[PDB]
Design an enzyme around this catalytic site. Sequence first.
Site, PDB file in Angstrom:
ATOM      1  N   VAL A  33       3.792  -0.734   4.586  1.00  0.00           N
ATOM      2  CA  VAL A  33       2.498  -1.224   4.832  1.00  0.00           C
ATOM      3  C   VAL A  33       2.001  -2.102   3.576  1.00  0.00           C
ATOM      4  O   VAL A  33       1.847  -1.355   2.486  1.00  0.00           O
ATOM      5  CB  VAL A  33       1.459   0.011   5.151  1.00  0.00           C
ATOM      6  CG1 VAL A  33      -0.003  -0.577   5.412  1.00  0.00           C
ATOM      7  CG2 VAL A  33       2.290   0.697   6.245  1.00  0.00           C
ATOM      8  N   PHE A  35       9.433   4.000   8.825  1.00  0.00           N
ATOM      9  CA  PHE A  35       8.999   3.278  10.095  1.00  0.00           C
ATOM     10  C   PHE A  35       8.940   1.893   9.563  1.00  0.00           C
ATOM     11  O   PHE A  35       9.198   0.988  10.317  1.00  0.00           O
ATOM     12  CB  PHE A  35       7.917   3.867  10.722  1.00  0.00           C
ATOM     13  CG  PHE A  35       8.398   5.230  11.507  1.00  0.00           C
ATOM     14  CD1 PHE A  35       9.347   5.324  12.567  1.00  0.00           C
ATOM     15  CD2 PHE A  35       8.000   6.526  11.086  1.00  0.00           C
ATOM     16  CE1 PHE A  35       9.639   6.336  13.588  1.00  0.00           C
ATOM     17  CE2 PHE A  35       8.277   7.596  11.754  1.00  0.00           C
ATOM     18  CZ  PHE A  35       9.025   7.656  12.674  1.00  0.00           C
ATOM     19  N   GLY A  36       8.184   1.708   8.591  1.00  0.00           N
ATOM     20  CA  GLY A  36       7.736   0.271   7.896  1.00  0.00           C
ATOM     21  C   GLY A  36       6.724   0.480   6.777  1.00  0.00           C
ATOM     22  O   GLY A  36       6.033   1.369   6.638  1.00  0.00           O
ATOM     23  N   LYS A  82       1.579  -3.526   9.059  1.00  0.00           N
ATOM     24  CA  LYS A  82       2.794  -2.685   9.097  1.00  0.00           C
ATOM     25  C   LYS A  82       3.767  -3.798   9.648  1.00  0.00           C
ATOM     26  O   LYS A  82       3.845  -4.451  10.494  1.00  0.00           O
ATOM     27  CB  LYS A  82       2.733  -1.485  10.378  1.00  0.00           C
ATOM     28  CG  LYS A  82       1.760  -0.617   9.681  1.00  0.00           C
ATOM     29  CD  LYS A  82       1.591   0.544  10.536  1.00  0.00           C
ATOM     30  CE  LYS A  82       1.095   2.120  10.073  1.00  0.00           C
ATOM     31  NZ  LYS A  82       0.875   2.875  11.082  1.00  0.00           N
ATOM     32  N   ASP A 126      -1.311   7.518  12.228  1.00  0.00           N
ATOM     33  CA  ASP A 126      -0.431   7.717  13.291  1.00  0.00           C
ATOM     34  C   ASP A 126      -0.778   7.940  14.811  1.00  0.00           C
ATOM     35  O   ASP A 126      -1.906   8.836  14.866  1.00  0.00           O
ATOM     36  CB  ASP A 126       0.701   8.797  12.875  1.00  0.00           C
ATOM     37  CG  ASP A 126       1.754   8.240  11.979  1.00  0.00           C
ATOM     38  OD1 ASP A 126       1.988   6.967  11.629  1.00  0.00           O
ATOM     39  OD2 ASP A 126       2.390   8.859  11.418  1.00  0.00           O
ATOM     40  N   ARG A 170      -2.560  14.670   3.701  1.00  0.00           N
ATOM     41  CA  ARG A 170      -1.852  13.367   3.380  1.00  0.00           C
ATOM     42  C   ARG A 170      -1.673  12.233   4.199  1.00  0.00           C
ATOM     43  O   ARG A 170      -1.326  11.227   4.105  1.00  0.00           O
ATOM     44  CB  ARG A 170      -0.333  13.659   2.833  1.00  0.00           C
ATOM     45  CG  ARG A 170       0.549  14.429   3.593  1.00  0.00           C
ATOM     46  CD  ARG A 170       1.492  15.130   3.132  1.00  0.00           C
ATOM     47  NE  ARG A 170       1.738  16.090   2.156  1.00  0.00           N
ATOM     48  CZ  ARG A 170       2.523  17.033   1.594  1.00  0.00           C
ATOM     49  NH1 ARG A 170       3.950  16.708   2.147  1.00  0.00           N
ATOM     50  NH2 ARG A 170       2.171  17.608   0.589  1.00  0.00           N
ATOM     51  N   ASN A 171      -1.968  12.742   5.696  1.00  0.00           N
ATOM     52  CA  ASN A 171      -2.207  11.791   6.862  1.00  0.00           C
ATOM     53  C   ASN A 171      -3.261  11.483   7.114  1.00  0.00           C
ATOM     54  O   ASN A 171      -3.540  10.869   8.283  1.00  0.00           O
ATOM     55  CB  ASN A 171      -1.242  12.431   7.850  1.00  0.00           C
ATOM     56  CG  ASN A 171      -0.071  12.965   7.489  1.00  0.00           C
ATOM     57  OD1 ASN A 171       0.735  12.501   6.538  1.00  0.00           O
ATOM     58  ND2 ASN A 171       0.594  13.930   8.195  1.00  0.00           N
ATOM     59  N   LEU A 228       0.624  -1.158   0.042  1.00  0.00           N
ATOM     60  CA  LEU A 228      -0.076  -0.082  -0.044  1.00  0.00           C
ATOM     61  C   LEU A 228       0.781   1.182   0.029  1.00  0.00           C
ATOM     62  O   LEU A 228       0.421   2.190  -0.590  1.00  0.00           O
ATOM     63  CB  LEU A 228      -1.020   0.042   1.224  1.00  0.00           C
ATOM     64  CG  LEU A 228      -2.188  -0.978   1.087  1.00  0.00           C
ATOM     65  CD1 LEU A 228      -2.892  -1.033   2.522  1.00  0.00           C
ATOM     66  CD2 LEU A 228      -3.026  -0.581   0.241  1.00  0.00           C
ATOM     67  N   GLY A 229       1.874   1.439   0.653  1.00  0.00           N
ATOM     68  CA  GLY A 229       3.024   2.503   0.912  1.00  0.00           C
ATOM     69  C   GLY A 229       3.791   2.594   1.914  1.00  0.00           C
ATOM     70  O   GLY A 229       3.630   1.213   2.907  1.00  0.00           O
ATOM     71  N   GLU A 230       4.666   3.289   1.675  1.00  0.00           N
ATOM     72  CA  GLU A 230       5.723   3.537   2.938  1.00  0.00           C
ATOM     73  C   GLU A 230       5.803   5.095   3.090  1.00  0.00           C
ATOM     74  O   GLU A 230       5.504   5.728   2.360  1.00  0.00           O
ATOM     75  CB  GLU A 230       7.086   2.787   2.168  1.00  0.00           C
ATOM     76  CG  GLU A 230       6.754   1.221   2.002  1.00  0.00           C
ATOM     77  CD  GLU A 230       7.730   0.691   1.124  1.00  0.00           C
ATOM     78  OE1 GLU A 230       8.723   1.602   0.675  1.00  0.00           O
ATOM     79  OE2 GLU A 230       7.728  -0.587   0.850  1.00  0.00           O
ATOM     80  N   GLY A 231       6.782   5.266   4.304  1.00  0.00           N
ATOM     81  CA  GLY A 231       7.363   4.564   5.294  1.00  0.00           C
ATOM     82  C   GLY A 231       8.170   5.190   6.317  1.00  0.00           C
ATOM     83  O   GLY A 231       7.564   6.087   6.969  1.00  0.00           O
ATOM     84  N   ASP A 235       2.299  16.253  12.926  1.00  0.00           N
ATOM     85  CA  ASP A 235       2.085  16.413  11.399  1.00  0.00           C
ATOM     86  C   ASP A 235       1.078  17.111  11.050  1.00  0.00           C
ATOM     87  O   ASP A 235       0.833  18.284  10.789  1.00  0.00           O
ATOM     88  CB  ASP A 235       2.527  14.933  10.534  1.00  0.00           C
ATOM     89  CG  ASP A 235       3.855  14.287  11.017  1.00  0.00           C
ATOM     90  OD1 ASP A 235       4.682  15.059  11.307  1.00  0.00           O
ATOM     91  OD2 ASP A 235       3.780  13.087  10.938  1.00  0.00           O
TER      92      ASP A 235
HETATM   93  C1  LIG Z   1       2.078   4.749   4.556  1.00  0.00           C
HETATM   94  C2  LIG Z   1       0.542   4.679   4.399  1.00  0.00           C
HETATM   95  O1  LIG Z   1       0.095   4.074   5.723  1.00  0.00           O
HETATM   96  C3  LIG Z   1      -1.287   3.337   5.795  1.00  0.00           C
HETATM   97  C4  LIG Z   1      -1.690   3.110   7.148  1.00  0.00           C
HETATM   98  C5  LIG Z   1      -2.923   2.441   7.360  1.00  0.00           C
HETATM   99  C6  LIG Z   1      -3.670   2.063   6.245  1.00  0.00           C
HETATM  100  N1  LIG Z   1      -4.866   1.692   6.161  1.00  0.00           N
HETATM  101  N2  LIG Z   1      -5.418   1.587   5.016  1.00  0.00           N
HETATM  102  C7  LIG Z   1      -4.425   2.183   4.079  1.00  0.00           C
HETATM  103  C8  LIG Z   1      -4.668   2.268   2.676  1.00  0.00           C
HETATM  104  C9  LIG Z   1      -3.532   3.158   1.816  1.00  0.00           C
HETATM  105  C10 LIG Z   1      -3.998   3.379   0.559  1.00  0.00           C
HETATM  106  C11 LIG Z   1      -5.050   2.962  -0.272  1.00  0.00           C
HETATM  107  N3  LIG Z   1      -5.079   3.446  -1.495  1.00  0.00           N
HETATM  108  N4  LIG Z   1      -4.141   4.064  -1.457  1.00  0.00           N
HETATM  109  C12 LIG Z   1      -3.677   4.734  -2.864  1.00  0.00           C
HETATM  110  C13 LIG Z   1      -3.982   6.236  -2.992  1.00  0.00           C
HETATM  111  O2  LIG Z   1      -3.173   6.872  -3.473  1.00  0.00           O
HETATM  112  C14 LIG Z   1      -3.277   4.040  -0.533  1.00  0.00           C
HETATM  113  C15 LIG Z   1      -3.270   2.627   5.037  1.00  0.00           C
HETATM  114  C16 LIG Z   1      -1.985   3.187   4.662  1.00  0.00           C
HETATM  115  C17 LIG Z   1       0.083   5.750   4.323  1.00  0.00           C
HETATM  116  C18 LIG Z   1      -0.365   5.835   2.641  1.00  0.00           C
HETATM  117 CL1  LIG Z   1      -0.314   4.603   1.586  1.00  0.00          CL
HETATM  118  C19 LIG Z   1      -1.161   7.110   2.196  1.00  0.00           C
HETATM  119  N5  LIG Z   1      -1.288   8.104   3.057  1.00  0.00           N
HETATM  120  C20 LIG Z   1      -0.840   8.063   4.416  1.00  0.00           C
HETATM  121  C21 LIG Z   1      -0.138   6.840   4.905  1.00  0.00           C
HETATM  122 CL2  LIG Z   1       0.300   6.898   6.585  1.00  0.00          CL
END
Ligand SMILES: C[C@@H](Oc1ccc2[nH]nc(/C=C/c3cnn(CCO)c3)c2c1)c1c(Cl)cncc1Cl
Length: 269
Positions: free
Chosen positions: A29, A26-27, A51, A166, A152-153, A21-24, A148
């Site tokens: 996801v 810290f870890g 995570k 967070d 974006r959060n 799903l994305g980073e990071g 923060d």
């Molecule tokens: C680093 C990532 O941490 C999290 C922590 C808990 C989460 N629960 N569920 C999601 C779903 C992520 C998602 C689902 N679709 N997409 C594409 C969208 O463009 C991204 C997710 C992501 C993040 C992200 Cl990936 C994005 N913003 C903040 C943060 Cl912290």
Amino acid sequence: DLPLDPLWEFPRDRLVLGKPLGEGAFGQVVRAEAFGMDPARPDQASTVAVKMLKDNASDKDLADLVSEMEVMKLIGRHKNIINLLGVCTQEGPLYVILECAAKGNLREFLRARRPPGPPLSFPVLVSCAYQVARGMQYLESRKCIHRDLAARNVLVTEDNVMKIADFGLLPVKWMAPEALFDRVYTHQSDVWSFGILLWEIFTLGGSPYPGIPVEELFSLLREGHRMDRPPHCPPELYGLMRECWHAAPSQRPTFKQLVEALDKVLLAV
Ligand SMILES: C[C@@H](Oc1ccc2[nH]nc(/C=C/c3cnn(CCO)c3)c2c1)c1c(Cl)cncc1Cl
């Protein structure tokens, strides 16, 4: 390593990972399929986010990670926050299971559905702001903070529920002056960032202080200048932004007062 928390432990056997799903920092996801996260039903297979440490790991990565897991245990459930569902510390690599927000973060959520020219109607935008305000008030009440605090959060569920990511006890265009210069963070500095986020919403995902490189920004704030009212944004909500951006922290509204104001705006239907 240690130990076994029966209020939270989940067997890895019922956890098949999926696409990242994305980073990071810290870890990583990853999306993941979990089996039996609601034990009233051992069959219903819902999705989660997991995570994990990426692997050239630490020595400052596992430390805060387990510290992150313990903090989420203590705060408990709330609708407008990324909740903790379970953890896997029993067979090797640490997994932390959380709610899944299908629609990504708030800034992507807004810009993706942007109009092309001159869905995201007015009440939905107020709904997003009200929910984030409800989440920040709860965090403050648990003597926890989130420094923060940018769009974006904030994550969006399948049902347009806002959930802050967070939790705990260089993004310079979001930071209150005292946290920027005196390097001190309070609940009142959180309210400043909320104002910036308020503006992020009603520009439908715009960049703050557009065209301004991030440096001289401090002089413009010292001169008393703030960002102008975005187009089609009602003056009531710009008034709240200006209150969040008052230089004196004690003159800023608290998160309680922002929930009542946004609530009164939502009641207008
Ligand atoms: C680093 C990532 O941490 C999290 C922590 C808990 C989460 N629960 N569920 C999601 C779903 C992520 C998602 C689902 N679709 N997409 C594409 C969208 O463009 C991204 C997710 C992501 C993040 C992200 Cl990936 C994005 N913003 C903040 C943060 Cl912290």
